[PDB]
Amino acid sequence: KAVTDMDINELRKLMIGKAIINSSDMQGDLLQEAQDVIQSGIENNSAPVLNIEAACKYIKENLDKKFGPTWQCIIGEGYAYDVTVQNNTLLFMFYNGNLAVLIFKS
């Protein structure tokens, strides 16, 4: 039982509303604001099947009004990027399973 019983297909199924942060160049207080908005945002327009365009229409507009005018946010299963950003303007947090969320302010 515990970790040994737990398989990938059981772990993903067991828990969908988990949260895990990889990088965090942005300030402590501004993360707390964004993290709540993106989680609530994606789950809303997750729909029957996960519209990756629809998710990042909502997150783009929300983070334009909330902070600054030129805010760029991309989500995906898997990808490689190099992205020039301003200081303390970038959060990289992936959602459970196969969802990688990069958000920054250019």
Binding site: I20, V85, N88, L90, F94, L99
Partner: peptide, 20 residues
Amino acid sequence: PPPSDTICGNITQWEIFDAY
């Protein structure tokens, strides 16, 4: 204006799960 630093990140299914 504030200095603007290049960042390079790669994400694969395993690296997500490994952290998870």
